[PDB]
Amino acid sequence: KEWQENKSWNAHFTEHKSQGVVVLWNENKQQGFTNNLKRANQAFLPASTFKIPNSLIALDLGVVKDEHQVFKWDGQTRDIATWNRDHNLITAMKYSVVPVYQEFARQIGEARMSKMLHAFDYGNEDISGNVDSFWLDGGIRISATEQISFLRKLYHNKLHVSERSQRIVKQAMLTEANGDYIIRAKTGYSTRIEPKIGWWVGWVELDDNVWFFAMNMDMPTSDGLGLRQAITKEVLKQEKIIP
Amino acid sequence: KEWQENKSWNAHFTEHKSQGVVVLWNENKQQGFTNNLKRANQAFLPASTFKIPNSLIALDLGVVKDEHQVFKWDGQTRDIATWNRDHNLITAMKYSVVPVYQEFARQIGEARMSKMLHAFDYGNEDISGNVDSFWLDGGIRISATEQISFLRKLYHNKLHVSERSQRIVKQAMLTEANGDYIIRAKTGYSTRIEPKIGWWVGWVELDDNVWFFAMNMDMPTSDGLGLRQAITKEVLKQEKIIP
Ligand SMILES: *C(=O)N1C[C@H](NOS(=O)(=O)O)CC[C@H]1C(=O)NNC(=O)C1CNC1
Numbered sequence: 001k002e003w004q005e006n007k008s009w010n011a012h013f014t015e016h017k018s019q020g021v022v023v024l025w026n027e028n029k030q031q032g033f034t035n036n037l038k039r040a041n042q043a044f045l046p047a048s049t050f051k052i053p054n055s056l057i058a059l060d061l062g063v064v065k066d067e068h069q070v071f072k073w074d075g076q077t078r079d080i081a082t083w084n085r086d087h088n089l090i091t092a093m094k095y096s097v098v099p100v101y102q103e104f105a106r107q108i109g110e111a112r113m114s115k116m117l118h119a120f121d122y123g124n125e126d127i128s129g130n131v132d133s134f135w136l137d138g139g140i141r142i143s144a145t146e147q148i149s150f151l152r153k154l155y156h157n158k159l160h161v162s163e164r165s166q167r168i169v170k171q172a173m174l175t176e177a178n179g180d181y182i183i184r185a186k187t188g189y190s191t192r193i194e195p196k197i198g199w200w201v202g203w204v205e206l207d208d209n210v211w212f213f214a215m216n217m218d219m220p221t222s223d224g225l226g227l228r229q230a231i232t233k234e235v236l237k238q239e240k241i242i243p
Numbered sequence: 244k245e246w247q248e249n250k251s252w253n254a255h256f257t258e259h260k261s262q263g264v265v266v267l268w269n270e271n272k273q274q275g276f277t278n279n280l281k282r283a284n285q286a287f288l289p290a291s292t293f294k295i296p297n298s299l300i301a302l303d304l305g306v307v308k309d310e311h312q313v314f315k316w317d318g319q320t321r322d323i324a325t326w327n328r329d330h331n332l333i334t335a336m337k338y339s340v341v342p343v344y345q346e347f348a349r350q351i352g353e354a355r356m357s358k359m360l361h362a363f364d365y366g367n368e369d370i371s372g373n374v375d376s377f378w379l380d381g382g383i384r385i386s387a388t389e390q391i392s393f394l395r396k397l398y399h400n401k402l403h404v405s406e407r408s409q410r411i412v413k414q415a416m417l418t419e420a421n422g423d424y425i426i427r428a429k430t431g432y433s434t435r436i437e438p439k440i441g442w443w444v445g446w447v448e449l450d451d452n453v454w455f456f457a458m459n460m461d462m463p464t465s466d467g468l469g470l471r472q473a474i475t476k477e478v479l480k481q482e483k484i485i486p
C-alpha cells in the first residue's frame with residue numbers, strides 16, 4: 001500500500017488552527033494519500049474507534065445476539081446524558097456508549113479478545129491492561145494507515161468472523177447517506193493517556209468507487225470535536241469525492 | 244391492523260394540486276394512520292416498488308450473488324440515461340434500472356416467482372402477464388396497507404428467504420441517513436396501465452421506534468415525481484416523526 005503525500009491538505013488544519021492527519025484510500029486505484037506520511041503511521045490508542053472490532057467480536061461470539069437486543073442502563077448516572085438509558089447496538093455505536101462496550105469486553109474475555117485481534121491484524125495486537133478498558137488506557141495502538149487496512153477487510157467481509165457479523169457492524173456504522181454518498185464511520189476521543197487526540201475512521205461509498213479514510217488530530221479539549229468530521233469533509237470536497 | 248383516519252393530511256396534497264394517500268404505521272404502538280381509508284386499501288400495480296421482493300428472491304435463489312456483482316449494460320440505449328451503464332444491486336435500486344430486474348425475473352422463472360409471492364403474502368399474489376413485466380402491466384396488485392404488512396416482515400427478517408437476503412435488500416433500500424433518522428424505501432411510477440400513480444414505500448428508523456410508510460398519489464406526468472417524497476415528508480414532519 002503506497003501512500004502519496006499531498007501537503008496542500010494542511011491548509012485545512014492550519015485554517016482551523018489544528019494539527020493532524022487525514023489518510024485516504026481509493027479502492028479502485030489501490031492508491032493512498034495523506035498530508036503526513038509520518039503521523040499517518042504513528043500508532044495511537046484507538047479509543048471509541050475500538051467499537052468496530054469490539055462489536056464484531058461480540059456479535060460473532062453471541063455476546064450480542066442482534067442489533068435489536070436491548071442493553072439495559074445499569075442506573076449509574078454518567079457525564080454524557082445519552083448514556084443514561086437503554087440502548088441497542090445501533091444506538092450504542094451512535095452515542096458511543098462505553099459502559100455497554102466495557103460489558104461486552106468482560107464477556108468476550110481476554111483470551112478470545114486477544115485471538116480475535118490477531119485474526120484481525122488489529123494495530124499492534126496488544127490487549128495489555130484491563131479487559132474492559134485496554135483500548136482507552138492499556139497497551140493497544142493503531143495507526144491511521146492500519147485503521148484503513150482493518151476497514152478494507154471489513155468492507156469486503158474478509159475478517160475471521162461471520163459475514164452476518166460484518167454486515168451488522170457495517171449497518172451500525174451508518175453515519176450519513178443521501179443521493180450522492182454513504183458514509184459509514186466511527187469517531188473517537190483518546191483523553192485518558194496523552195496525547196489527547198480525536199479520530200474519525202470509515203469510508204465513503206460512491207456509485208462506482210469507495211474511499212476509505214482515517215484521520216486523527218490533536219484535541220486538547222472537547223470543544224474541537226466537530227473538526228474531526230469537518231476537516232475530513234473539507235479534504236473530501238477538495239478531492240472531489242463528495243460535493 | 245387498525246387504521247385511524249386523519250384527514251388533516253389532505254392539506255399537503257391539496258396545496259400541491261394532488262390526490263393520493265399516505266399510510267403510516269407506528270411499530271411500538273402497533274397503530275396505523277392514513278388520510279384516506281378507502282384509498283389506503285385500494286390495490287394498484289406495484290411498478291418499481293416490486294424491486295424489493297424481486298431483489299429478495301433473486302438473492303435467495305443465487306440469481307444475484309451479492310451486492311457487488313456487476314450486471315453489464317446490454318448495449319441497448321433507453322430513455323433514462325442512468326440505465327445505459329453497468330450496475331450492481333445498490334445502484335440498480337438507486338436508479339431503478341428495470342432491465343436489470345427483468346433479467347432477474349426471467350432467470351427466477353414463473354414457478355418460483357409465484358411460490359415466493361405466496362410465501363410473502365404479496366398483494367393479490369397474482370403473477371398473470373409476462374414473466375418479465377407483470378409488475379408493470381400484468382395482474383399483480385397491492386394496496387398501500389399491504390405494502391406496510393410486507394415491509395414489516397422484511398424489517399423483522401420474517402420473510403421466507405435467508406436473513407442474508409433480507410439484510411442485503413434493506414441495505415440496498417437505504418435512501419437517507421443523518422443524526423435524526425434513517426429512511427429505507429423504494430419509489431415507483433406506474434404508467435403503462437391507468438390510473439398513472441406514483442409510489443413511495445419504506446420506513447423511518449428512529450433511536451427508539453420505527454415508522455413504516457406507504458404512499459401513492461395520482462401522477463399524470465413525470466413533473467410531479469418529487470412530490471412523492473415531499474408530501475410524505477410533510478406528513479412525517481406534521482406528525483413530529485422527523486424534524
Ligand atoms: C471514545 O473515544 N470515547 C467514548 C465517547 N465517544 O464519543 S466520540 O469521540 O465517538 O464522539 C466519549 C469520548 C471517549 C471516551 O470514552 N473518553 N472518556 C472516558 O471514557 C471517560 C472516563 N474518563 C473520561
Ligand SMILES: *C(=O)N1C[C@H](NOS(=O)(=O)O)CC[C@H]1C(=O)NNC(=O)C1CNC1
Pocket residue numbers: 289290291292338339340341379429430431432433434435
Ligand atoms: C418504476 O416504477 N419505474 C422504473 C423507473 N422508476 O423510477 S422511480 O419511480 O422509482 O423514480 C422509471 C419509472 C418506472 C417505469 O418503468 N416506467 N415505465 C416503463 O418502464 C415503460 C413505459 N414507458 C417505458
Ligand SMILES: [Cl-]
Pocket residue numbers: 170171174413414417
Ligand atoms: Cl445500511
Ligand SMILES: [Co+2]
Pocket residue numbers: 118119121125
Ligand atoms: Co498477529
Ligand SMILES: [Co+2]
Pocket residue numbers: 125
Ligand atoms: Co502477539
Ligand SMILES: [Co+2]
Pocket residue numbers: 124125
Ligand atoms: Co506481536
Ligand SMILES: [Co+2]
Pocket residue numbers: 155156311
Ligand atoms: Co467485495
Ligand SMILES: [Co+2]
Pocket residue numbers: 254255258477
Ligand atoms: Co404542507
Ligand SMILES: [Co+2]
Pocket residue numbers: 068398399400
Ligand atoms: Co426484530
